[PDB]
Write an enzyme that holds these catalytic residues in place. Structure first.
Site, PDB file in Angstrom:
ATOM      1  N   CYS A   1     -46.668 -57.370  -5.749  1.00  0.00           N
ATOM      2  CA  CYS A   1     -47.922 -56.798  -5.286  1.00  0.00           C
ATOM      3  C   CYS A   1     -48.752 -56.492  -6.467  1.00  0.00           C
ATOM      4  O   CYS A   1     -48.235 -56.475  -7.577  1.00  0.00           O
ATOM      5  CB  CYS A   1     -47.681 -55.498  -4.619  1.00  0.00           C
ATOM      6  SG  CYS A   1     -46.782 -54.630  -5.800  1.00  0.00           S
TER       7      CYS A   1
ATOM      8  N   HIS B   1     -35.252 -57.080  -0.578  1.00  0.00           N
ATOM      9  CA  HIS B   1     -35.687 -55.736  -0.346  1.00  0.00           C
ATOM     10  C   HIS B   1     -35.500 -55.470   1.121  1.00  0.00           C
ATOM     11  O   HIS B   1     -36.316 -54.879   1.737  1.00  0.00           O
ATOM     12  CB  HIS B   1     -37.160 -55.668  -0.637  1.00  0.00           C
ATOM     13  CG  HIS B   1     -37.512 -55.991  -2.046  1.00  0.00           C
ATOM     14  ND1 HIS B   1     -38.232 -57.110  -2.393  1.00  0.00           N
ATOM     15  CD2 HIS B   1     -37.256 -55.337  -3.202  1.00  0.00           C
ATOM     16  CE1 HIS B   1     -38.430 -57.117  -3.701  1.00  0.00           C
ATOM     17  NE2 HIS B   1     -37.862 -56.042  -4.216  1.00  0.00           N
TER      18      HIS B   1
ATOM     19  N   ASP C   1     -34.056 -53.215  -8.324  1.00  0.00           N
ATOM     20  CA  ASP C   1     -34.579 -54.533  -8.638  1.00  0.00           C
ATOM     21  C   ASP C   1     -35.485 -54.275  -9.795  1.00  0.00           C
ATOM     22  O   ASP C   1     -35.243 -54.707 -10.895  1.00  0.00           O
ATOM     23  CB  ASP C   1     -35.372 -55.081  -7.421  1.00  0.00           C
ATOM     24  CG  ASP C   1     -36.324 -56.320  -7.750  1.00  0.00           C
ATOM     25  OD1 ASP C   1     -35.902 -57.291  -8.409  1.00  0.00           O
ATOM     26  OD2 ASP C   1     -37.513 -56.441  -7.313  1.00  0.00           O
TER      27      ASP C   1
ATOM     28  N   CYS D   1     -47.140 -49.549 -12.813  1.00  0.00           N
ATOM     29  CA  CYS D   1     -47.793 -50.620 -12.064  1.00  0.00           C
ATOM     30  C   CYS D   1     -47.393 -50.645 -10.704  1.00  0.00           C
ATOM     31  O   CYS D   1     -48.176 -51.100  -9.936  1.00  0.00           O
ATOM     32  CB  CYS D   1     -47.437 -52.011 -12.543  1.00  0.00           C
ATOM     33  SG  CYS D   1     -45.855 -52.092 -13.351  1.00  0.00           S
TER      34      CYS D   1
ATOM     35  N   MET E   1     -59.734 -34.917 -40.067  1.00  0.00           N
ATOM     36  CA  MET E   1     -61.107 -35.162 -40.399  1.00  0.00           C
ATOM     37  C   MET E   1     -61.827 -33.929 -40.033  1.00  0.00           C
ATOM     38  O   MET E   1     -61.363 -33.244 -39.117  1.00  0.00           O
ATOM     39  CB  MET E   1     -61.629 -36.282 -39.521  1.00  0.00           C
ATOM     40  CG  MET E   1     -60.895 -37.566 -39.812  1.00  0.00           C
ATOM     41  SD  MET E   1     -61.431 -38.380 -41.342  1.00  0.00           S
ATOM     42  CE  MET E   1     -63.324 -38.480 -40.827  1.00  0.00           C
TER      43      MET E   1
END
Ligand code: FMN
Ligand code: AMP
Ligand code: SF4
Lengths: 608, 233, 189
Positions: A30, A172, A267, A351, A470
């Site tokens: 997906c 799955h 998986d 993801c 800085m």
């Protein structure tokens, strides 16, 4: 130069009536696209086309409204509107000269169907161990024919649509697997009990599908040869092999995985509990009985590891998911021997986080154009180069500012990157030091590698680490035409949280018995026998620290005022994180916030 | 008072270079930069210059039009002037010929301290500084990992970094040629507003005749070995 | 003729690489009448006689200077002083931090052939061929020494395999040129 041991990787292969230019295969996964985002769907796979993966696939694809994954988004191929929108992608994978698969899915009671409202059918009546409110109807024999026709239907429309590959998606733990697996299948008629009962559904389905587009499209299946649940579900050495055996004449290709749906973390292995190749021991077992092409993922990003599993006759091809999101170009980089340019997927599973939340688009922690290729039209390997002489100061060289420079310098600018730390990476550097997250380094690793490379190519451009922080005077007087401040965030010192949005009275971590996850992580400051982690954070910080300290043998209680590790439910990490905190006897007090800290003592409260 | 620092522009190859004649590598595979050691040099000297109240730091380089690139980077990193000595006949001077050419600049310049790096990043001769020291006839030490010198001392105190890491203290009569080793200090970096203002400075160009040499003095004809072959092993 | 080897020591101890060089030297002799001379330098350099009294050494020259340990002025002088007076074909030194400090000067003054961090050597006819690294060690670089009657080499340590066993070198003593080092060792750290 391409190391010639990797040549092996560019050798075609035969899959039924179809031919894979090379070994690099993007399995179905997906992306937050489906049939609904036809721009985004086409672009993101077509770059991987152009990137030179061999075959690209849509994510799991619904054959009928009674498998609707809403709120999740899957793809669909229900009607001629769908065949429109998915063709956008096939044409587009075609113009670069690889193949387009589409993954034919029906998932029975795992499909909650919150959009289509229809009733889902299965081998036996159950309720999903994942959408626990969502029950199926028991199919009688007429239900067996009508649903099977479904796939047929969907396989036809897949060819109109221009797919070169079609699957009978059986992993799955979706329909065909539910039949196979006794966990689900309580039938005592001819579709149940005997191993050839169980696999009849799928066996049938496969055939019907072959008959249907068999001569124009390779039929592949994906199959979940072990559930890694043990006895009582599929075991590779029990039902797994045998099934492979009973199917083999139908399949043009196996596409192998292990796991179910409820914890498919197995998986899609977190790098936090799995390495590369993890799956192999159960991957292997499939070649030892199949006479057909076999691929089988396992976070394969290393071409060395890639060649191992082929020259040891454990796969035939290379199946990728995540790693193709990280680097759509990973093949042409390997073909081009450009080993250092390869963006290594970290296994962070963000993801999978988006899709798993139900709706949003995939995003990715190495590949920031992922999701961004249609709609922002960013290409991962081509950049608009500047038409001026302009220059950029960047303060801080963490994820943010380091990409900052990477991209700019790739854009041709003149850049000076500076940070007070000694190395590129901002806080990733501790993060990756937390137990398990050692493969999240990769995200500065890649940056360090490319900025270095970018500097020899821009001559004005400059890296400066080990600097004096800085100041705004240094900055105004610096002479960059433009400035990017990328200076970070720190843990809160003062008990400031998401509940109260104010400080916890008696919280302050300059005191001796009070730590931040910087101070725990630096390792200097000294840590008492009894620890309490006061947690307002739903993501990894808390658990992880918990792990650390426990393994260092402190006594550990997490006080949580939020649901702990919630995010993790969504990266697939949560099971093995919990089991892990159990194993190390970590104490969890939920639903519990805190109202004042005192030396050696805190006041905690139930939030209900 | 004046410290002269002898700097080099080295080459770094790309993957996958190819040999050319069989006497060198092809020139398209090459990328020029300030030898790494010299960054540690230039600093030590800026260190000294800033430790006092008046010290000219001056960098000198032998070679072609490219080098400029590096000497400017020295300007920006701190140097006060930068000198480039050249002539085409200097082609292929080896590390001892360089000593000599440097030396003659070194005399005109007449400094009180000469700094060289310990070795080049490219040919790693580990000869050029000491060579300048023989020809000059100065007190030398090689491999310096610590300097205590105040301006116009007759006398300094160094530490050699020996094999495996053990140091050795030396007391050395000045003016002395010293080769500076890595880790000696933390060489600064140039602000853009820095690099910008060193663009506007002159590189002084010095000719072989300016330094009392001639074609017959330099280039590989004079050198101490001769190239037979170069081959990727 | 003769090959010269300069051995190296520090805090009372002979360094390994000294046997390597003797090994190298013997390895590269062009016929079995050619002699290897070895030289150790130090105000107690005789303590070393026993361990440099090994196989391949045809001579061991002990040179006492100012310093106990390595000094460049002293060394430099000491060696050109050994070369002057044995006339060798080659001299070997270790490529050691001690050597950086004076190998090169020796070559600067005389024009002998010189090359450093050598890790191949080899006669071809009577032509001496030593191999170096180029480009941070990305190629190998073969060089020779046209018309040079003396060549000076620094040799990459832990390349050349030693000789086994004892040996019977003619030992001699000679003083280092009474010259004041322009430096002074104080302590190690
Ligand atoms: C979605 C998401 C983003 C992830 C990364 C994986 C995934 C997703 N959707 C899938 C689906 O539509 N069907 C299907 O069969 N597989 C799907 N995947 C899993 C993917 O195909 C891989 O099996 C795993 O990611 C493990 O392999 P790897 O990425 O380590 O190479
Ligand atoms: N051609 C040159 N011009 C100025 N300095 C040089 C030159 N060649 C070598 N060097 C110096 O020699 C140092 C040591 O390098 P080397 O002996 O070549 O390994 C370099 O930093 C410079 O200090
Ligand atoms: S979000 Fe992480 S695990 Fe996923 S593809 Fe990206 S780098 Fe890989």
């Amino acid at each position: 130069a391409r190391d010639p041991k990797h040549d092996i990787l560019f050798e075609p292969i035969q899959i039924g009536p179809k031919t894979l230019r090379n070994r690099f295969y993007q399995v179905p996964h997906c992306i937050g696209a489906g049939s609904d985002k036809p721009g985004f769907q086409s672009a993101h796979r077509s770059v991987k086309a152009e990137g030179g993966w061999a075959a690209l696939n849509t994510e799991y694809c619904s054959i009928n409204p009674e498998s609707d994954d809403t709120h999740r988004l899957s793809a669909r191929i229900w009607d001629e509107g769908d065949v429109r929108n998915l063709k956008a992608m096939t044409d587009e994978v075609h113009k670069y000269g690889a193949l387009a698969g589409v993954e034919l899915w029906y998932g029975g009671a795992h499909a909650p169907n919150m959009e289509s409202r229809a009733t889902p059918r299965g081998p036996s009546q159950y309720a999903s161990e994942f959408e626990t409110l969502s029950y199926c109807k028991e199919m009688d024999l007429s239900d067996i024919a009508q649903v099977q026709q479904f796939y047929v239907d969907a396989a036809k429309r897949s060819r109109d649509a221009g797919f070169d590959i079609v699957y009978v998606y059986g992993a799955h733990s979706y329909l065909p697997l539910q039949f196979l697996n006794p966990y689900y299948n309580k039938r005592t008629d001819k579709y149940g009990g005997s191993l050839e009962n169980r696999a009849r559904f799928w066996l049938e389905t496969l055939e019907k599908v072959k008959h249907a587009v068999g001569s124009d499209c390779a039929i592949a299946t994906r199959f979940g040869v072990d559930t890694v649940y043990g006895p009582g579900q599929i075991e590779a050495e029990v039902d797994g092999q045998k099934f492979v055996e009973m199917a083999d004449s139908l399949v043009d290709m196996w596409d192998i995985t292990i796991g179910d749906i409820a914890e498919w973390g197995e998986d899609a292995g977190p790098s936090r509990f799995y390495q590369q190749g993890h799956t192999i021991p159960w991957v292997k077992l499939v070649k030892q009985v199949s006479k057909k092409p076999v691929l089988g993922v396992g976070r394969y990003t290393d071409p060395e590891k890639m060649i191992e599993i082929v020259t040891k006759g454990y796969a035939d091809i290379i199946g990728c998911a995540r790693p193709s999101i990280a680097d759509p170009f990973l093949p042409q980089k390997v073909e081009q021997g450009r080993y250092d340019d390869i963006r290594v997927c970290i296994g962070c599973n963000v993801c999978i986080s988006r899709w798993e939340i139900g709706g949003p688009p995939m995003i990715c922690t190495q590949n920031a154009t992922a999701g961004e290729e249609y709609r922002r039209g960013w290409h991962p390997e081509k950049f608009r180069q500047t038409k001026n002489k302009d220059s950029v100061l960047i303060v801080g060289a963490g994820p943010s500012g380091s990409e900052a420079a990477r991209v700019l310098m790739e854009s041709g600018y003149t850049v000076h990157l500076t940070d007070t730390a000694e190395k590129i990476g901002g806080h990733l550097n501790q993060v990756a030091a937390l137990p398990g997250l050692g493969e999240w380094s990769y995200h500065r690793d890649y940056r360090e590698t490319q900025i270095t490379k970018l500097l020899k190519k821009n001559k004005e451009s400059q890296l400066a680490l080990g600097q004096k922080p800085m100041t705004a005077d240094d900055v105004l007087q610096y002479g960059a035409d433009k400035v990017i401040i990328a200076t970070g965030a720190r843990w809160n010192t003062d008990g400031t949280n998401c509940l109260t949005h104010d400080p916890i009275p008696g919280a302050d971590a300059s005191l001796p018995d009070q730590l931040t996850p910087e101070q725990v992580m630096d390792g200097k400051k000294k840590i008492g026998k009894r620890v309490v982690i006061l947690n307002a954070d739903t993501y990894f910080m808390a658990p992880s620290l918990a792990e650390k300290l426990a393994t260092a043998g402190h006594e550990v209680t997490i006080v949580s005022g939020v649901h702990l590790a919630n995010y993790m439910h969504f990266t697939l990490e949560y099971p093995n994180m919990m089991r892990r905190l159990h194993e190390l006897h970590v104490e969890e007090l939920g639903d519990h916030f805190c109202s004042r800290i005192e030396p050696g003592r805190m006041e905690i409260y139930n939030i209900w | 008072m004046k410290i002269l620092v002898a700097v080099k522009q080295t080459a770094a190859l790309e993957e996958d270079f190819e040999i050319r004649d069989g006497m060198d590598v092809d020139e398209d595979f090459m990328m020029y930069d300030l030898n790494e050691w010299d960054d540690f040099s230039l600093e030590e000297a800026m260190k000294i210059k800033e430790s006092s109240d008046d010290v000219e730091v001056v960098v000198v380089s032998v070679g072609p039009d490219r080098v400029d690139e590096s000497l400017r980077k020295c300007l920006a990193k701190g140097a006060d002037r930068a000198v480039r000595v050249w002539d085409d006949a200097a082609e292929g001077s080896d590390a001892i010929v360089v000593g000599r050419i440097l030396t003659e600049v070194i005399k005109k310049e007449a400094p009180d301290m000469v700094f060289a790096g310990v070795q080049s990043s490219d040919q790693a001769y580990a000869s050029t500084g000491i060579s300048v020291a023989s020809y000059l006839n100065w007190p030398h030490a090689a491999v310096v990992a610590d300097l205590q010198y105040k301006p116009g001392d007759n006398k300094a105190v160094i530490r050699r970094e020996l094999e495996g890491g053990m140091l050795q203290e030396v007391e050395i009569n000045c003016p002395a040629v010293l080769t500076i080793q890595l880790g000696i200090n933390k060489p600064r970096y140039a602000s853009l507003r820095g690099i910008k203002q060193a663009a506007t400075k002159p590189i002084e160009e010095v000719s072989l005749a300016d330094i009392g040499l001639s074609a017959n003095d330099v280039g590989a004809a004079q050198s101490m070995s001769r190239v037979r072959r170069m081959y990727i092993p | 003729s003769k090959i010269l080897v300069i051995a190296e020591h520090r805090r009372n101890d002979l360094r390994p690489v000294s046997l390597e060089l003797i090994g190298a030297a013997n390895g590269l002799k062009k016929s079995g009448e050619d002699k290897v001379v070895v030289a150790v330098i130090g105000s107690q350099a005789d303590a070393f006689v026993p361990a440099l009294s090994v196989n391949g050494v045809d001579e061991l020259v002990v040179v006492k200077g100012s310093s106990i340990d390595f000094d460049p002025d002293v060394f430099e002088a000491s060696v050109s002083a050994l070369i002057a007076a044995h006339n060798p074909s080659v001299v070997l030194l270790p490529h050691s931090v001690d050597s950086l400090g004076y190998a090169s000067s020796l070559a600067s003054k005389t024009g002998y052939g010189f090359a450093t961090d050598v890790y191949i050597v080899e006669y071809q006819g009577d032509e001496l061929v030593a191999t170096r690294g180029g480009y941070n060690q990305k190629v190998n670089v073969e060089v020779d020494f046209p018309g040079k009657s003396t060549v000076v080499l620094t040799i990459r340590p832990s390349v050349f395999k030693p000789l086994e066993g004892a040996g019977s070198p003619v030992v001699s003593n000679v003083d280092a040129p009474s010259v004041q080092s322009r430096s002074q060792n104080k302590d190690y750290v």
